[PDB]
Amino acid sequence: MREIVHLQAGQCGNQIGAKFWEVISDEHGIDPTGTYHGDSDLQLERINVYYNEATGGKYVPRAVLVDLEPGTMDSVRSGPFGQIFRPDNFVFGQSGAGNNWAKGHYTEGAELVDSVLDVVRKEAESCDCLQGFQLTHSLGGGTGSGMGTLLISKIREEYPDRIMNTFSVVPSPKVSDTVVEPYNATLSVHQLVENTDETYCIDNEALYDICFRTLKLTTPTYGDLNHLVSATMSGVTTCLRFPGQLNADLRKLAVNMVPFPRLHFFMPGFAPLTSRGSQQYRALTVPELTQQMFDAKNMMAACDPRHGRYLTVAAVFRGRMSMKEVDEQMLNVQNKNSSYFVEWIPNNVKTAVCDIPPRGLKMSATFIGNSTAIQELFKRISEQFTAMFRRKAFLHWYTGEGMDEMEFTEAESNMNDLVSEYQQYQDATAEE
Amino acid sequence: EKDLQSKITAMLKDSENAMWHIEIQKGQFEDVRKHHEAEAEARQRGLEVH
């Protein structure tokens, strides 16, 4: 029946995927052994979306870990839930990527690609019918970015009628990890805009700022970021995992949420981000959550949505409140904040409430919007790419791999066209 | 100069072997380019102007 196949790429992708698996296992009541220790009702019927039916009721995960470094599988396996996955899916090579996109795509992307295609085709044939494929990776390296684009292209070529959703990590000039990071981001954007259905923006600096200034944590680490992104993913996927009154699915969003195929980027966000001392002093209501989901402070963007206009908005709720409050809130917001959304298209916010509350928290609601704020990131990426491609720095490595430089030129032309398109649709006037 | 030009003609027969490879090049490597060079140039105008 309707199942979702999950994919893994990049060390950060691997760790966030493991965190998501642990979070969903805890929420649905699964012991680290592999059996079932839940006590709910809807945690048995649609549990097969991410698991598989086996003897003795031992559900197995459905995720393929793709990596170029063997040191990642050892790290993720030693965890409390690393002994539950399929070791066959841990397809690792012998040579690392070295934060190179071209080298990994060519060298470590030819003789290793066949095995992961074989395992994913076996998994797809194992189920009856599927909807889409979820891949969580990062653009910071040659592992997630070099292989994710190739595998997405392969699966789209083989099975065009599937959902291509991903949650890659955007870079940031303030917080970097690779000197040639803008090169790899440049190379990845072309494949993302050419051979990907939808893509969501993930930033680490914004999450760090959010936790520091709102959560007020002592020693924030990558574990907190993985926890937050996993909670975001569960909030996104609860529309299908836990059906309620008004259920939705990934493709209905991706159709209603994307005006043009060349603009498929989104802006994801969670509402209740409070400090440890404020959990016992809070007022659970609609207007508070609307304000936290509308302001730019809770938003995990490393930019300002207020500089442009809102294009499409989706408010996904998870709780038992009402229906009237959401629509009245949206109506009055559109009435007052008239200079923040496209006037040519009214009713840009979608209503969605999940009647099944999450485990451990009664109230949850995730924000999936596509506001006019990413243009700053695109233009700065283009500017830095131009600056570094002017004198052709850090290029002899890619040249020594064998690929020519015309790919950089066609890519930069593509981003210039795309940023021109974004700025031209930014101030969408009614008439002349 | 005379013996080095006899040698330049010997290494020019070797460079003629290089040109013998060059006719495999100008038998197939531009045989493909006869079509794929033309169908890789026209549409820059499409992206450029319109």
Partner: peptide, 25 residues
Amino acid sequence: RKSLNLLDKMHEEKDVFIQKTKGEL
């Protein structure tokens, strides 16, 4: 492809060698 890039690169280097040989001869 870059084994496809060898297609152009090898014959272009051979053309450069043709220039060198013509000059030297």
